[PDB]
Design a protein around this ligand. Structure first.
Ligand SMILES: [Zn+2]
Length: 416
């Protein structure tokens, strides 16, 4: 199992894996759960990571959904925690998911906080502050936090804190990733491509498996933890869908990469090679920075332990004297793993689900779901339960046939 404890929300705090924490304005502490080394879950709406997003009311775009009361009660938080746990187990049960989660846990954000070259130092915004049994705070490094959505319930995304001059998600360093996510809602899509990619057609017959949606965000998180995310200012000015063109819709290269399959091929070979070279250069910077460091700051870890952590993360070569370098062959291999093997399209193949065929579509609807009961959804089958009417033809994802598992909250078709 990926998650050794089946936490209940009302389990007592212990200051270790069930604790009140603060994240790096003023905030009150929030109850959080450490589901795995380097990975925490905060069953709260995210009113914390962005100062401009401190409340839960609408400011509405077609694809949005608002309910300021979602995820306010203990029962909802208990189910949130169980649902997120189940999705991590579903992911981890696949070879591809085990690979991705292993990469994520090994992807410790770089200790790039020193302004003195000869010293190696943590960056504080890659930590959380945990209330200990005596009521005082300690600082804990972590890689990933799953948190509830902000005002728009269905705006899922990977958020992280910046640095004053460093671009941590694009300079190889990485940073702690906060994924706004809910297991309590999902998207409807259409099985015919010419309907799915038309904004005027379809009610959302099939439901997206939320394990795919979480995997998608985890793939972004992998890019961002390794500091290889593509700048969102690099976009495909889509010219393969007449409706996209009418509205001038642009899609980031980072999204196309993450989806994979034919979408990723809209990044041409020259651009692919440019980015590979750019990020290779960032890993070389990191090796040079590590070589300059002769002392560590803080008392919790030795310099040789931290140099090993980063050797293992970046797959660096180390000579006998202890000098690091980047092997271009190993770089290309890791870069390829993170960017081409870990894709939405590949997850679809492992989960054996129906899914959108492209990111360049129009979402059809949003449904309320409940994946916690095993009669509804399982680690091994998702909605498409074996030895039932739901096992065949993705019938479990068919919102018409498995109608008790989906309640439509909003239609998007006709609003674009
Ligand atoms: Zn995405």
């Amino acid at each position: 199992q990926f998650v050794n404890k089946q936490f209940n929300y009302k389990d007592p705090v212990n200051g270790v894996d069930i604790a009140y924490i603060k994240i790096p304005g003023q905030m009150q502490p929030v109850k959080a759960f450490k589901i795995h080394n380097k990975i925490w879950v905060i069953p709260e709406r995210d009113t914390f990571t962005n100062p401009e997003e401190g409340d839960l009311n609408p400011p509405q775009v077609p694809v949005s959904y608002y309910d300021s009361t979602y995820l306010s009660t203990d029962n909802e938080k208990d189910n949130y925690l169980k649902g997120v746990t189940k999705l991590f187990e579903r992911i981890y049960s696949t070879d591809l998911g085990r690979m991705l989660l292993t990469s994520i846990v090994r992807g410790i954000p770089f200790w790039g906080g020193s302004t003195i070259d000869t010293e190696l130092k943590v960056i504080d915004t890659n930590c959380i502050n945990v209330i200990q049994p005596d009521g005082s705070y300690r600082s804990e490094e972590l890689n990933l936090v799953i948190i509830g959505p902000s005002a728009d319930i269905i705006q899922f995304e990977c958020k992280s804190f910046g640095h004053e001059v460093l671009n941590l998600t694009r300079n190889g360093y990485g940073s702690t990733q906060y994924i706004r996510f809910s297991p309590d809602f999902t998207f409807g899509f259409e099985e015919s491509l010419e309907v799915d990619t038309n904004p005027l057609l379809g009610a959302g017959k099939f439901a997206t498996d939320p394990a795919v949606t979480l995997a998608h965000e985890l793939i972004h998180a992998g890019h961002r933890l390794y500091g290889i995310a593509i700048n969102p200012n690099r976009v495909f000015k889509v010219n393969t869908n007449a409706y996209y063109e009418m509205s001038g819709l642009e899609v980031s290269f980072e999204e196309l990469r993450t989806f994979g399959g034919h979408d990723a091929k809209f990044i041409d070979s020259l651009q692919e090679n440019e980015f590979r070279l750019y990020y290779y250069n960032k890993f070389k910077d990191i090796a040079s920075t590590l070589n300059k460091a002769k002392s560590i700051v803080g008392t919790t870890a030795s310099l040789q332990y931290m140099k090993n952590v980063f050797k293992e993360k970046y797959l660096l070569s180390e000579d006998t004297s202890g000098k690091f370098s980047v092997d271009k062959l190993k770089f290309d291999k890791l870069y390829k793993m993170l960017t081409e093997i870990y894709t939405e399209d590949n997850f679809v193949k492992f989960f054996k689900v129906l899914n959108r065929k492209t990111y360049l579509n129009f979402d059809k609807a949003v449904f309320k779901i409940n994946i916690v009961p095993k009669v509804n959804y399982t680690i091994y089958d998702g909605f498409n339960l074996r030895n039932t009417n739901l096992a065949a033809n993705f019938n479990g994802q068919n919102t018409e046939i498995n109608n008790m598992n989906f309640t439509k909250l909003k239609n998007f078709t006709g609003l674009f």
